[PDB]
RNA sequence: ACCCUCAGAAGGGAGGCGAAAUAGAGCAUGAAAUCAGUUGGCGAUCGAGCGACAGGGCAUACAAGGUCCCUCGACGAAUGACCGACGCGCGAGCGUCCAGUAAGACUCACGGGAAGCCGAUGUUCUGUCGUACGUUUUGAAAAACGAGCCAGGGAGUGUGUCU
RNA sequence: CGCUCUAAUUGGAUGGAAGUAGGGGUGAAAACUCCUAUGGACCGAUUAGUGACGAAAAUCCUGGCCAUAGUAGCAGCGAUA
RNA sequence: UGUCCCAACGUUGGGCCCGGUGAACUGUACAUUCCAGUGCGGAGUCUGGAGACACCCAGGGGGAAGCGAAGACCCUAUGGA
């Protein structure tokens, strides 16, 4: 598992983490990238809109074959990874919760840092023609989130 | 309130005229990197020098641009070869007794990294009193 | 006999692999193979006096 | 759209290649040059074989492309480009600080460069850039 | 342990223990390949053995390197003048004298200056040269063969006899 | 030049050894050395020895890993649910 | 009698976009190429020119003497059956 890769002042900061989540690591880099800098509350509203299909998530690196989306600004390819988005909603729920329990205005805090890290693959095997089997794995993803007072 | 190195830190050795001339030359002429051929093209190939042995090797055949190949002609002047850039001849020291017989006007001392702080303190004060410069001194807040 | 207790055979040309003796899909016996024999090891018959 | 040229050359009755060579030399030396009256520049030889050459350049091509200019404007500008390392920084800079014009958009008159002049009273076998362009099918806008 | 969060004996947060939890369970150390985030340099008009050697930009906590730059002067190898005077050539130009003089790489001294400043390191730009490596071969950049990448593994050894 | 272990002689280490990472110095070079961080217990030098002693390559071996790619497949069969 | 002249329209399943799941082949390096030439005479990488703003989607497969298999042909071996 990871450790926070960035320093954080406990007096004006709140943290949260996801562990070994079996979801697209590629969708996670995309989502992290997109919500960094936003306010928790904005992030949440943004991710609810993605899951609802009203807001696409720019796919700038893992974009092969991805169709263009008119609402993607400054870029072309985008999608709606609702699974990894729900995992981030859990992360944000935990973060904002911690934030509040400490006396902060959770929803109003800025996402100072958010990054996904691939911690491994849950291994699987798939039978194929001609007597062989090939890999059929699940990515395991850790993601860190640091909220910071405005 | 600030850090200061122990010992004769700013000390310089006395060199004959011909030695200062050759020291200055070595420093002006320098030498090529002499890294192994194509070490930059493959991570599994380290920089450590290996004679290019390929029958068709471009560096072996001596093509301009493929880097210089190690030859005796690149050797530094005998009279200065191995001297610290300050001009001192280095003496490896593992304890106080190693300071004995060292000429602080011509040699500087280098305390092995493996030597502890307790013993380094003694070596350092005995070196200064013997007029010997310590190349890798301890910095104390004075 | 270390490294030699195996009937490992090479498949030869055909399956895009180097001609290395294999058993149960594992390379064996030869010196370049992990778990293979020692090419020129210490020998008991050597006169060390 | 205004071109502060340090030099204004008059190509009228001047050998194109000889002017081109000096304009390139000067552009590389950092001069901003404006070649004027390009349509009147001249090129020696049999009009028939000269034109056959430029027509071939017009017919050459394929998907990648071989866009050859037809106006005296570009013919001349291209002639100069072939004398400049236009793909290198210094070469592109020189090339871009040179411009060719149909007629003379300036108030000042250009100067005639030494050695580039052709005496019509002593020559009959020569052609005019304008004549070449018209043959190539250019729209005689000049 | 207790507390908060959560669908939750999960996970997360805060907290407790210990010299150390970046010793919290395949739990000493923790390389490379490589991944996330980020810092420096380059970057959407431009060309490909990825560099070597020179020289510029930008970047640089300390430590382990401390030099570097400009005026002038001294020394001054090979080489080596202008100008001027005189004399030749149809001409481009040349000879003789000035003169082996002025100059001349390195090194040193005086005076002044730099501390991202000199070295060095990262990256990039310019110049010159440059179509990997190993092997096969008369001839390899080769449209001949080998390797996806990294780490570790991986080939003159013993006895007897002879020289 | 470097690696392993043996012996003699002689040193270093919890006032921080080996290793690793980044960085400074030396050597034509093999490679040597220092600084800082990490690490938390072992490590050298000289001399004479010992040898399962040095890798870029063998469609070399084993392990790990990237691009491929969020791609192919998750349709086709007289049983379209 | 749509085999053909000479093709058209339609049906079902794919293809395309979205959620989820999620491989493999292949990879010396670099790589935006084109026309000529050169070169072990069959070059994206050498030379000269030409062209060339970056990225992405769909496509049919011209080229990489494409990938797959240490040529089953031919010869050679004081080889095998
Ligand atoms: Cl992934
Ligand atoms: Cl020598
Ligand atoms: Cl064309
Ligand atoms: Cl060019
Ligand atoms: Cl004429
Ligand atoms: Cl000198
Ligand atoms: Cl041998
Ligand atoms: Mg697609
Ligand atoms: Mg079967
Ligand atoms: Mg390398
Ligand atoms: Mg074994
Ligand atoms: Mg561990
Ligand atoms: Mg080799
Ligand atoms: Mg001894
Ligand atoms: Mg090894
Ligand atoms: Mg594809
Ligand atoms: Mg064969
Ligand atoms: Mg036959
Ligand atoms: Mg037979
Ligand atoms: Na991309
Ligand atoms: Na858009
Ligand atoms: Na848009
Ligand atoms: Na066995
Ligand atoms: Na024996
Ligand atoms: Na002509
Ligand atoms: Na054309
Ligand atoms: Na630089
Ligand atoms: Na070969
Ligand atoms: Na070769
Ligand atoms: Na070839
Ligand atoms: Na592979
Ligand atoms: Na293979
Ligand atoms: Na039909
Ligand atoms: Na094709
Ligand atoms: Sr991409
Ligand atoms: Sr130490
Ligand atoms: Sr065969
Ligand atoms: Sr000229
Ligand atoms: Sr804690
Ligand atoms: Sr002189
Ligand atoms: Sr290896
Ligand atoms: Sr070995
Ligand atoms: Sr993969
Ligand atoms: Sr179905
Ligand atoms: Sr089917
Ligand atoms: Sr070219
Ligand atoms: Sr297709």
Residue D15 is given by DSSP the state B
CATH of the domain at A69: 3.90.470.10
Q: What's the CA gap between A72 and A58, in Å, rounded?
A: 6
Query: How many structural domains is chain B composed of?
Result: 1
Going along chain D from its start, the domains and CATH numbers come out as 1-142 (3.90.1180.10)
The rounded Å distance from CA D14 to ligand 8 centre is 61
Nearest to C33 by CA among C8, C13, C14: C8
Residue with tokens 């001392």: B109
In DSSP terms, D8 is beta-bridged to D34
Cα dihedral A73/A79/A82/A87 (nearest 10): -70
Q: Which of residues 101-140 of B touch strand E (CB under 7 A)?
A: 110, 135-137, 139
Nucleic strand E under 7 Å from the C-beta of C31:
yes
- What is the enclosing helix (H) or strand (E) of D47? helix D47-59
> Interface partners of B (3+ CB pairs, < 8 Å)?
none
Residue with tokens 């060719």: D100
Here the tokens at position B6 are 């122990």
Nucleotide nearest to A1 (CA to C1'): E22
In terms of C-beta density within 10 A (0-12 exposed, 13-18 middle, 19 or more buried), how is residue B80 classed? buried
Distance CA D113, CA D16 (A): 11
Domain residues for the domain of A77 are 1-150
Q: Where are the alpha helices (DSSP H) in D60-127?
A: 72-81, 89-96
Please spell the DSSP secondary structure of chain A, one letter per residue: ----SS---GGGEEEEEEEEE-S-HHHHHHHHHHHTTSBHHHHHHHHHHHHHTSS-EE-SSS-TTPPB-TT-SSSSBEE--HHHHHHHHHHHHHHHHHHHHTTS-GGGSEEEEEEEEEEEEE--EEE-GGG-EEE--EEEEEEEEEEE--
**Number of separate domains in chain A:** 1
CA dihedral D33, D36, D40, D41 (to 10 degrees): 0
CA–CA gap between residue D113 and residue D8 (Å, rounded):
10
On whether the CB atoms of residues B39 and B75 are closer than 8 A, the answer is: no
Q: What is the end-to-end Cα distance of chain D in Å, rounded?
A: 18
Q: How far apart are alpha carbons B63 and D84 in whole angstroms?
A: 30
CB-based contacts of C24, cutoff 8 Å, min separation 6:
none
Q: Which domain holds residue B109?
A: 1-142
Q: How many residues are recorded in chain D?
A: 142
Residues in chain B: 142
Tokens standing for residue D54: 């430029």
Bases of chain E within 7 A of a CB of the protein = 4-6, 8, 11-15, 22, 32-38, 46-47, 49-54, 62-68, 106-108, 120, 125-130, 132-137, 140-141, 149-160
Asked if C17 CB < 7 A from strand G, the reply is yes
């Amino acid at each position: 598992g990871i450790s926070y890769s960035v320093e954080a002042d406990p007096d004006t900061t709140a943290k949260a983490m996801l562990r070994e989540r079996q979801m697209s690591f590629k969708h996670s880099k995309a989502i992290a990238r997109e919500i960094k800098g936003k306010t928790a509350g904005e992030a949440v509203d943004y991710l609810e809109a993605v899951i609802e299909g009203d807001q696409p998530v720019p796919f700038k690196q893992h974009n092969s074959g991805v169709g263009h989306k008119s609402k993607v600004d400054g870029w072309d390819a985008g999608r709606y990874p609702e699974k990894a988005s729900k995992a981030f909603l859990d992360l944000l729920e935990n973060a904002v919760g911690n934030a509040d329990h400490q006396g902060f205005d959770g929803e109003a805090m800025t996402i100072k840092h958010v990054a996904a890290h691939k911690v491994g693959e849950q291994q699987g095997r798939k039978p194929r023609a001609m007597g062989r089997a090939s890999a059929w794995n699940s990515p395991q993803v850790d993601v860190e989130l640091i909220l910071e007072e405005p | 309130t600030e850090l200061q190195a122990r010992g004769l830190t700013e000390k310089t050795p006395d060199l004959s005229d011909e030695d200062a001339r050759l020291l200055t030359q070595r420093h002006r002429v320098g030498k090529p990197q002499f890294n192994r051929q194509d070490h930059h093209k493959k991570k599994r190939v380290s920089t450590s020098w290996r004679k290019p042995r390929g029958q068709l090797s471009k560096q072996r055949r001596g093509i301009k641009g493929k880097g210089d190949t190690v030859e005796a002609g690149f050797r530094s002047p005998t009279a200065v070869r191995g001297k610290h850039p300050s001009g001192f001849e280095e003496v490896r020291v593992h304890n106080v007794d190693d300071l004995e017989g060292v000429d602080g006007d011509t040699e500087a001392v280098r305390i092995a990294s493996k030597v502890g702080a307790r013993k380094r303190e003694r070596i350092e004060e005995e070196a200064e009193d013997a007029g010997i410069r310590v190349l890798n001194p301890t910095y104390v807040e004075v | 006999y270390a490294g030699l207790r195996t009937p490992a055979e090479s498949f030869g040309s055909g399956r895009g692999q180097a001609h290395v003796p294999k058993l149960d899909g594992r390379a064996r016996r030869v010196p370049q193979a992990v778990k293979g024999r020692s090419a020129h090891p210490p020998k008991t018959e050597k006169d060390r006096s | 759209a205004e071109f502060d040229a340090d030099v204004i050359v008059d190509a009228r009755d001047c050998i194109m290649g000889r002017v081109a060579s000096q304009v390139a030399e000067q552009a590389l030396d950092g001069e901003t040059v404006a070649v004027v009256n390009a349509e009147r520049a001249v090129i020696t030889g049999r009009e028939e074989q000269i034109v056959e050459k430029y027509e071939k350049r017009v017919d050459i091509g394929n998907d990648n492309g071989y866009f050859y200019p037809k106006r005296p404007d570009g013919i001349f500008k291209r002639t100069i480009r072939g004398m400049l390392p236009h793909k290198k920084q210094r070469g592109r800079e020189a090339f871009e600080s040179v411009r060719v014009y149909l007629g003379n958009p300036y108030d000042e008159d250009g100067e005639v460069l030494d050695g580039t002049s052709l005496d019509r009273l002593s020559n009959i076998k020569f052609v005019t850039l304008g004549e070449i362009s018209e043959t190539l099918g250019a729209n005689k806008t000049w």
